[PDB]
Amino acid sequence: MEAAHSKSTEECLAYFGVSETTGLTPDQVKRHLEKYGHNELPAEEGKSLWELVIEQFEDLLVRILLLAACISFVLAWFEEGEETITAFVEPFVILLILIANAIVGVWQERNAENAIEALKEYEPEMGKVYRADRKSVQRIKARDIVPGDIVEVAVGDKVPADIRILSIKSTTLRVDQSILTGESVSVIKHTEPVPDPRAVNQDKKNMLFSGTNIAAGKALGIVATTGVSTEIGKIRDQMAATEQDKTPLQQKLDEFGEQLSKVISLICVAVWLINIGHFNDPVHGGSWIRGAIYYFKIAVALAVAAIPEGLPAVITTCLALGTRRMAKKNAIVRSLPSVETLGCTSVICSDKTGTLTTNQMSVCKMFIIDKVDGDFCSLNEFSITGSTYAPEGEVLKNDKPIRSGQFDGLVELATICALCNDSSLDFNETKGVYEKVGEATETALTTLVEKMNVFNTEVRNLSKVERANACNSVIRQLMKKEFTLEFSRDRKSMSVYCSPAKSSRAAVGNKMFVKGAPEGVIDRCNYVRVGTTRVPMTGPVKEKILSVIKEWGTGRDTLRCLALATRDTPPKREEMVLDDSSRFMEYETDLTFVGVVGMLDPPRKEVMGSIQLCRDAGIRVIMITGDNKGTAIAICRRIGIFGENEEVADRAYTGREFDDLPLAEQREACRRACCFARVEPSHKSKIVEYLQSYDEITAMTGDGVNDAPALKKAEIGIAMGSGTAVAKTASEMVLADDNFSTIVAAVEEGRAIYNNMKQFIRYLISSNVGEVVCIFLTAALGLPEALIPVQLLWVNLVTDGLPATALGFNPPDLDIMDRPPRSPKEPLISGWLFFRYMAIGGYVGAATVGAAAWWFMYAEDGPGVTYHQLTHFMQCTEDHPHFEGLDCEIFEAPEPMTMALSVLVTIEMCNALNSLSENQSLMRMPPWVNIWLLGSICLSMSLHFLILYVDPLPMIFKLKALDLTQWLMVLKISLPVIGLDEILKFIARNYLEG
Template sequence: MDLLEFSRDRKMMSVLCSRNQLNVLFSKGAPESIIARCTTILCNDDGSIVPLTADIRAELTSRFHSFAGKETLRCLALALKWMPSGQQMLSFDDERDLTFIGLVGMLDPPRAEVRNAMLSCMTAGIRVIVVTGDNKSTAESLCRKIGAFDHFIEFSERSYTASEFEELPPLQQTLALQRMALFTRVEPSHKRMLVEALQNQNEVVAMTGDGVNDAPALKKADIGIAMGSGTAVAKSASDMVLADDNFASIVAAVAEGRAIYNNTKQFIRYMISSNIGEVVCIFVAAVLGIPDTLAPVQLLWVNLVTDGLPATAIGFNKQDSDVMKAKPRKVNEAVVSGWLFFRYLVIGAYVGLATVAGFIWWFVYADSGPKLPYVELMNFDTCPTRETTYPCSIFDDRHPSTVSMTVLVVVEMFNALNNLSENQSLLVVPPWSNMWLVGSIIITMLLHILILYVHPLSVLFSVTPLSWDDWMVVFYLSIPVIIIDEVLKFFSRNPIGLRLRLWFRRSDLLPKRELRDK
């Protein structure tokens, strides 16, 4: 006949029913709310109604906590009240002096994969706070059943109801937020409050929700995550919608996002180290006073073709096995830290030096070269104005620049293999883990060989065919880039390099990420 909808402040609902001229109010809701409104109880033995004494009330409360705690049941309490026969409407005042009928326990077991998903988050430095409208005892028992919070020595200091939290002084609220793992009897307004409070502590917050009232919290969160079974309002306010309503899907998305982020960093690393190598090559040649090691057309070929294919293929790197073991970077931390940029500089410097070394090798040491004294190479520009034992035309020979260009190409191919993983060794992440990269390296080398040995192309790019001895020197000058990066990766992986990483973190080279105001 009439209905009082469920509300979060009352935590119950009531309905007025009529049959055979008898009006009865039936109520259901949270046990603590229903029991507090009951003054009598219906006996199972004879159907009589007796007063709800303090002892009976205590027994009901104990039984409820047993259901909610030990048996992890979600509990509802049921009650009734006989109403005047002529009453057609209900008011909230009618929800008093009820007769307690009983408790209903429902088992809602957690998914089997939730435990591992939560442990993966904790290993990754992602803090998990369970936020629920359920009873505190039920939620605590369920968390213990999952086993995800077994590492807490004292769980009671990490579990709060919304009312308990609101009663704390501001300073204690701040401390509670820092160690909170479970937040129960929560209303939508508490979710938004929790998001704002955590953001004020410089935390990046992801919030899940499914109802219309969850929309403000989802919108305010840095990452709003709506359930696929949720309302359209919740979905529109969110950044991500789960198709299967599974927490493990969130963790999988985090892992995938980290993999994409790492691949982006590897792409940046490859391109920066390549450009640094070219700059170092030009700078060193100028400092040493030797001819330009590379022609503009050769630099263009390296940048557009030989760098482009491997750089694109790096985006297909597989997810590192330890992607969920690395701690998340801070909100104000740059994408490329000082330590990482130092690694770029080291690799780039070697690329440049190796390129120049190939040029000098042909002039000074190669059997097919002029074997000039190094001082003669440095004074190449004065050759026409003085007497020499060699023709000045050797400085126009295309062999030295071809060796340099080939060194630059090959060393970049080896450096591309370094970028299969930021910190994992090639012994752990082998080249065939990304066949796209292997294919791009093969194609790049075939294209480079093509311009070396096909006459019209060799003329266009000012190169000449190389001998077997030339190729061996190219290989010897290029392969150390892998050894150097393996050493740097070792320092990045192991505690022995922690102090170095912290020292280089003082200066960040790329722009910092700012929290967006949603």
């Protein structure tokens, strides 16, 4: 029964056909259980280790590699010779990388936690019901509770399901539902029906929400819903139905993979069409078997050369280091991939309280009526000093500190603030300061009462923990608080009923003290207090009051105003139904206006600047707040979201105004709005969807369980460090300090990380292009392998990996926050850079093939068979070229390959330097601009000499230490690549403008 809040208790018992005194019968249970199912959120889909291991070999490139591993294994099974010590090595290394790769994937998916499974923290194991099969309350498993069940809850209990309250056994029922409605204070519950079938949870005063806690009292009620039908269960289904998309980089990397396997297969088809002449060779004889192996051999090398095997580890490592760095800046990233998205943020939706403001409330102004004489009226306005909850401060008039007690009006003002209050003050020793004990707004009143000191008391004779309630305790001992009519959104006021203490047995003397939003309170006032006297509320006097409230709430003071009144002749105690909130406004009528207090929840010191950075970075900032609209706008103007005088009528909306707009207009409304006042949790989700329909990359803050859906929906959900664990687990980022500024700072950081990632992604992929050219060249020229998989793999995982990582540390561009958000669809490589990397690739393909062909021919230590063309053959059966001799296994000599590899390594070290900047000459941006890079290059070269000399290695890699002459030919061939790019960069800098 999802509409229970609006039905009578009798109608709910009737609907389910249950007896309040007995509970459900065993047949009702079986039938209800079968109909509504068990009371629990569905269990997560179990994912077996095998399934988790298989999903690892799901990527297109890992498959290509696995295929390469097979060919490499079978090819190593029928190898010619006996170099088994350095044979099965190749297929093993490939297979091992796939294993490590899988281990990492499985590892991460283990220590990962989902927000849904976290919701289960709010469902208790046990519950207490009343069933016909017994007379005493029996505690069963929450899981077995069902709709219709008469249930019992008491202080300390965790609500087991959504329940309609039947009867409150205690004097009052208090519930802590902070996690669902964001109501910090525990709230009071009643049993009367709430007429609105669409009432938001805060208005459902007769319901207990599954997952919340009873703060005080004992109550009996009937279960309305269970499982996914509860409020928390509905949040659970929303989250489950939320499909998140891959980040822009993941998408680009996925399109890269698809196209890469398309190129690989194409290059294989090519090597075939360039050797179609073999179909003309004589059938008998020939190297049929030795030719097939040759083709499959370049296929493996081709796949290994195309795939940037070390790029993922470089990405992860750069994200981790950046992540640890952001932490220091108070931004805790939970999802590494989110960093890029954060850099692309175009819209930041931010709750105001505690994020844009400090959540430190203090009264700054206050006024009372001075006098009324016909059309003439005068007020007595004051100011108060001190922005802390601390009783440190003083009242003043015309900037002169006065004695509050010297004004009768102020004495009553303080009385009301003192009594009509559910909060207090406490001196936290751990911090040495003060902490609000209750609502921020009420505590401000408490503090005010202390600073005012209407009854000149000796507070300086007490400590920091005693005078924390000095002047307050004084007011209490005067008036006895009988009962309090809690605050309600519809009347926007609250009040306490008080009887004098000095008058034990008095038939009169009772007063109701009222506090609330100005408009409603002032309209219910028939009298205005002037000092101790009283006069009727008149038009001239009301306008005067409203006049000043408007200036304080809508003006540059940006203050939340509260009207304070007194019911001089309150109804007789017995004639009041303290259980039907619907009549509270009635009891708070015929009031006497006492005064108005204006308090400020000050903007963070750093938000003013951060709002500017966002405007300079082309990022929109939307403020979400509980303030009334007029004060919401005034606050926006104050922090810079709106101009001090710009029209913003169609850029600021209340939840109500927005629901009144048809769907078409709500969408448009979100494209230009920067202020949303008084919205329900559902609004955040819709705002996101509408922003996503404009392709915005949205960042959205939240803290309660009710924010989870939206936090999950937003590309960057941002949770409060001081918020719920559920909100955290549903967010990409957590602000350890709750500061809006930490957001802006995290976005810049995201911008600076992406630019560097781009440089090392282009650097690694560029090298792969070159590697392939070398393999394709050595396939069209019929030359012996210049590079083999085991060598390429080392270069792609180690040699190039260090430099790639170093580029991650490239200094950021000074104007990072001076350009609009990057477009998600922006490709990493195209146009002139595409041409550049092709040119560099062709260059790299020749520099490597040449170095090896240079050793086989024009060399001082190798076969002086110049122009001999190894193309002719590798069969060695006709000896057409050589007229006399016995030697052909030199074609497998490690010397030529060591030249090829040293060229690649060296060229790549030079190409790392060319990657410091996309278009800046090494003259403008020298290499030493990044010491990490220089240092990395030295490390890579020393590792190159490691596999050349440390015996076990040179054999494993088929390498052979080079001669100073062979080395000088390396540097001769390599170094020039720096000049090649410099020229290409020069062309991009001058002859390519727009």
